[PDB]
Swiss-Prot record, chain A:
Disulfide pairings: none
Positions with biased composition (Basic residues): 104-114, 123-134
KW Nuclease (keyword) present: no
Listed name of the protein: Small ribosomal subunit protein eS24A
Name of encoding gene: RPS24A
Source species: Saccharomyces cerevisiae (strain ATCC 204508 / S288c)
Swiss-Prot record, chain B:
InterPro entries, per database record: Ribosomal_uS4, Ribosomal_uS4_CS, Ribosomal_uS4_euk/arc, Ribosomal_uS4_N, S4_RNA-bd, S4_RNA-bd_sf
Oligomer status and interactors: Component of the small ribosomal subunit (SSU). Mature yeast ribosomes consist of a small (40S) and a large (60S) subunit. The 40S small subunit contains 1 molecule of ribosomal RNA (18S rRNA) and 33 different proteins (encoded by 57 genes). The large 60S subunit contains 3 rRNA molecules (25S, 5.8S and 5S rRNA) and 46 different proteins (encoded by 81 genes). Interacts with snoRNA U3. uS11 interacts with MPP10. Component of the ribosomal small subunit (SSU) processome composed of at least 40 protein subunits and snoRNA U3.
The gene coding this protein: RPS9A
Residues in S4 RNA-binding domain copies: 106-180
Annotated GO biological process: maturation of SSU-rRNA from tricistronic rRNA transcript (SSU-rRNA, 5.8S rRNA, LSU-rRNA); ribosomal small subunit biogenesis; translation
Protein name in the entry: Small ribosomal subunit protein uS4A
PROSITE patterns in the cross-refs: RIBOSOMAL_S4, S4
Keywords: Cytoplasm, Isopeptide bond, Nucleus, Phosphoprotein, Ribonucleoprotein, Ribosomal protein, Ribosome biogenesis, RNA-binding, rRNA processing, rRNA-binding, Ubl conjugation
Location of Phosphoserine modifications: 183
GO molecular function terms attached to this record: rRNA binding; structural constituent of ribosome
Swiss-Prot record, chain C:
Phosphoserine sites (modified residues): 12
Taxonomic path: Eukaryota, Fungi, Dikarya, Ascomycota, Saccharomycotina
Naturally occurring in which organism (per UniProt): Saccharomyces cerevisiae (strain ATCC 204508 / S288c) (Baker's yeast)
Miscellaneous section: Present with 37600 molecules/cell in log phase SD medium. There are 2 genes for eS30 in yeast.
Subunit structure: Component of the small ribosomal subunit (SSU). Mature yeast ribosomes consist of a small (40S) and a large (60S) subunit. The 40S small subunit contains 1 molecule of ribosomal RNA (18S rRNA) and 33 different proteins (encoded by 57 genes). The large 60S subunit contains 3 rRNA molecules (25S, 5.8S and 5S rRNA) and 46 different proteins (encoded by 81 genes).
Positions carrying Phosphothreonine: 44
Protein name: Small ribosomal subunit protein eS30A
Curated annotation (Swiss-Prot), chain D:
Subunit structure: Component of the small ribosomal subunit (SSU). Mature yeast ribosomes consist of a small (40S) and a large (60S) subunit. The 40S small subunit contains 1 molecule of ribosomal RNA (18S rRNA) and 33 different proteins (encoded by 57 genes). The large 60S subunit contains 3 rRNA molecules (25S, 5.8S and 5S rRNA) and 46 different proteins (encoded by 81 genes).
Post-translational modification: Hydroxylation at Pro-63 affects translation termination efficiency. The stereochemistry of the 3,4-dihydroxyproline has not yet been determined.
Gene: RPS23A
InterPro entries attached to this UniProt entry: NA-bd_OB-fold (IPR012340), Ribosomal_uS12 (IPR006032), Ribosomal_uS12_euk/arc (IPR005680)
Entry keyword Metal-binding: no
Protein name per its UniProtKB record: Small ribosomal subunit protein uS12A
Family (UniProt): Belongs to the universal ribosomal protein uS12 family.
Location relative to the cell: Cytoplasm
Domain of life per record: Eukaryota
RNA sequence: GGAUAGUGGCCUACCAUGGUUUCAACGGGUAACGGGGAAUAAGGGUUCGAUUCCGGAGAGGGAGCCUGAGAAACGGCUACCACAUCCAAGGAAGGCAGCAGGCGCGCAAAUUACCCAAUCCUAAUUCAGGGAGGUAGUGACAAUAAAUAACGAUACAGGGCCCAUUCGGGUCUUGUAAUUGGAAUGAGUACAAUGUAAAUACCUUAACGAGGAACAAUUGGAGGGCAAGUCUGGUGCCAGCAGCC
């Protein structure tokens, strides 16, 4: 790009979650938009921590272009990020795997199934076998 | 459950519709200040009516009345901030007197025309809505602006459009491709 | 006089004429521009009382 | 003098006197009695579906001379018989019989509009097909 | 005195005959839940308020009750009434005025979708669950902004001023135009990033995207109130128009 000049604003250290938080602006002219991974590597080298440790979310583009503004958040390390952050944030960064599930309606259906069943099920299985034998 | 969003209009239709004097006056205003809508005209008249009711029901009160002081100073402050009022006429009777023409000349489109980036208020309109303008370092595409005079000091063309550079044009590149094929 | 018939008489009996072609007119602020430049800088009909639809006189 | 008392403790006399005079007023009466809901055909509703049964050739009141081509309608929710002015030209031929038409009022709040006596209501649609649309051929009525 | 968690006709035993009323009791009606408020106004006021918030009532109509701190619970039981289902006819299971969705009623009202990412709540509890809630789909209910077109030169017609050397120039005008040219982005396609739980939209910007045949703004109305035809054709108190005349 041409002079992104990523600049942080309102920085503050929160030692309780053991992190530091700020609202950040990038100035991109002659340029469609920055990317999240680009922003993360830039903040990792300007604040020296790690790429998988620094985080970002938001980044609305100001009208007409020429700049965007969002929230950037660096952690004390990768392990701190992994333990504290949400799974959706980790998986959109690529640091973890989004566990696959079915539809919520299907989870509720199987929930109703094993709610209508009582006990483990082996006895009912043997009973249904002995019943459907004839 | 979600607390309901306030909404309220910013215009009011005429009490009595068909008065040729009124109609010709607001048509005069639209065709000289480059407008599309008697809606917009009513809107400006509604702002003027709002401030006029405020001015009346404030100047009704005695001097050194802290209500009069506070509300009149805030009205003065925003009127000087927008430039509809001057920087040396603070006696509240000019506020009683002020004009839809004053509001319209403080708008952006005819301001652009006075600054000379248009050659016609309609040209100013099409430049505003096609975003070949910016008052600060960010583009705006609304005629109805009520400028704050820092914009006035800071007018220029759109940086991210020709007449302020950075690109020749969509149809410019189109014509260039045409001439490239012709030369080829 | 037994006229519970004849409905649609003149609408059926009318000689069908159709709208001639013409360019699409200015829209919106352009229309108000046309109205201003027709009514005021065009001084075309100011005889005594400013007609707007002059019948052929 | 003037009639109306003036004492500082007679507001009761004032309200009850005013109550009687409001009963003498027009719209207070029919509103508080619910004539629109108990005796009027619509039931105070803005419109109403209906089924035409036959045609009527009401002549125009004086000073005028015409025949107004209205119709006879029955409602559904009520089952009351209503007359209705088929407004425009040819629309009667459009709305011949059995049609599940829509009716509304004239614009005079329970009275007849012009030289059209006995009629307070008119037709606006035909089974979900508008009469102006039929008249200008922007749409067309399902034939069957 | 019983009952209540508690006062008290709350209920019982005995006793006195009282209590409310034209300052509208009691009975009837209500398209009556009340209120914070909404429309509307010089003042006074009138009308509405089912409806996001507060307090009430109800779970098809009534009655009863277990568990529990808290229910007269209904997404808890028991019976009756009216509804309605599955039957290998012996029997069994239900209450969408919860979210979607359907029939009917009508003038009159959305998808049988995605997510717990937020806002909160619950549990033994950070971790789970939540049609509470958020997202998207339908959506011209209402509100904000705002495209549909502009600009230069070429053929006519002007107004100041210079020459006042005739009606020659008109320097400059501002419109009239089967004149001509450019540049100028948007609607829509977007590669993409961003958006968000995942998205789809907004904003961003590549690449593609007008000369009107282009990308085509309708709805009312022209005798008055009430602004806008003494125009053309058809009709002939017929058809029809018109809120009032």
């Amino acid at each position: 790009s041409d002079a992104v000049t990523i600049r942080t604003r309102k920085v503050i250290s929160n030692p309780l979650l053991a992190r530091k938080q700020f609202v950040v602006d990038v100035l991109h002219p002659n340029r469609a938009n920055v990317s999240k991974d680009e922003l993360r590597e830039k903040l990792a080298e300007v604040y020296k921590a790690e790429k998988d440790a620094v985080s970002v979310f938001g980044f609305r583009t100001q009208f007409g272009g020429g700049k965007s503004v969002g929230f950037g958040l660096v952690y004390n390390s990768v392990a701190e990020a992994k333990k504290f952050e949400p799974t959706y944030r980790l998986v959109r960064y690529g640091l973890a795997e989004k566990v696959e599930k079915a539809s919520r309606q299907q989870r509720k259906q199987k929930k109703n199934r094993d709610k209508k069943i009582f006990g483990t099920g082996k006895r009912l299985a043997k009973k249904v076998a002995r019943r459907n034998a004839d | 459950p979600r607390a309901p969003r306030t909404y309220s209009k910013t215009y009011s239709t005429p009490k009595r519709p068909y008065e040729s004097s009124r109609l010709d006056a607001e048509l005069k205003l639209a065709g000289e200040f480059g407008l599309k809508n008697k809606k917009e005209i009513y809107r400006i008249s509604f702002q003027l009516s709002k401030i006029r009711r405020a001015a009346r029901d404030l100047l009704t009160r005695d001097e050194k009345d802290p209500k009069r002081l506070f509300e009149g100073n805030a009205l003065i402050r925003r009127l000087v901030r927008v430039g509809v009022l001057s920087e040396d006429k603070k006696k509240l009777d000019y506020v009683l007197a002020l004009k839809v023409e004053d509001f319209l000349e403080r708008r952006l489109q005819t301001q652009v025309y006075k600054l000379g980036l248009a050659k016609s208020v309609h040209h100013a309109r099409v430049l505003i809505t096609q975003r070949h303008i910016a008052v600060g370092k960010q583009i705006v595409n609304i005629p109805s602006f009520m400028v704050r005079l820092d914009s006035e000091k800071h007018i220029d063309f759109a940086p991210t459009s020709p007449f302020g550079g950075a690109r020749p044009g969509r149809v410019a590149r189109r014509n260039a491709a045409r001439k490239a094929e012709a030369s080829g | 006089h037994g006229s519970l018939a004849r409905a649609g008489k003149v609408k059926s009996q009318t000689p069908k004429v159709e709208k001639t072609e013409k360019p699409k007119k200015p829209k919106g602020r352009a229309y108000k521009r046309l109205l201003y430049t027709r009514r005021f800088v065009n001084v075309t009909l100011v005889n005594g009382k400013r007609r707007m639809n002059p019948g052929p006189s | 003098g003037k009639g109306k008392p003036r004492g500082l403790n007679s507001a009761r006399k004032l309200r009850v006197h005013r109550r009687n005079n409001r009963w003498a007023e027009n719209n207070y009466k029919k509103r508080l009695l619910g004539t629109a809901f108990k005796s009027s055909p619509f039931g105070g509703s803005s419109h109403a579906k209906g089924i035409v049964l036959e045609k009527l050739g009401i002549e125009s009141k004086q000073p005028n001379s015409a025949i107004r081509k209205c119709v006879r309608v029955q409602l559904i929710k009520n089952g009351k018989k209503v007359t209705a002015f088929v407004p425009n030209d040819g629309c009667l031929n459009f709305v011949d019989e059995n049609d599940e038409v829509l009716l509304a009022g004239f614009g005079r709040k329970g009275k007849a509009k012009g030289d059209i006596p006995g009629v307070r209501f008119k037709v606006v649609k035909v089974s979900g097909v508008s009469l102006l649309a039929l008249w200008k051929e922007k749409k067309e009525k399902p034939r069957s």
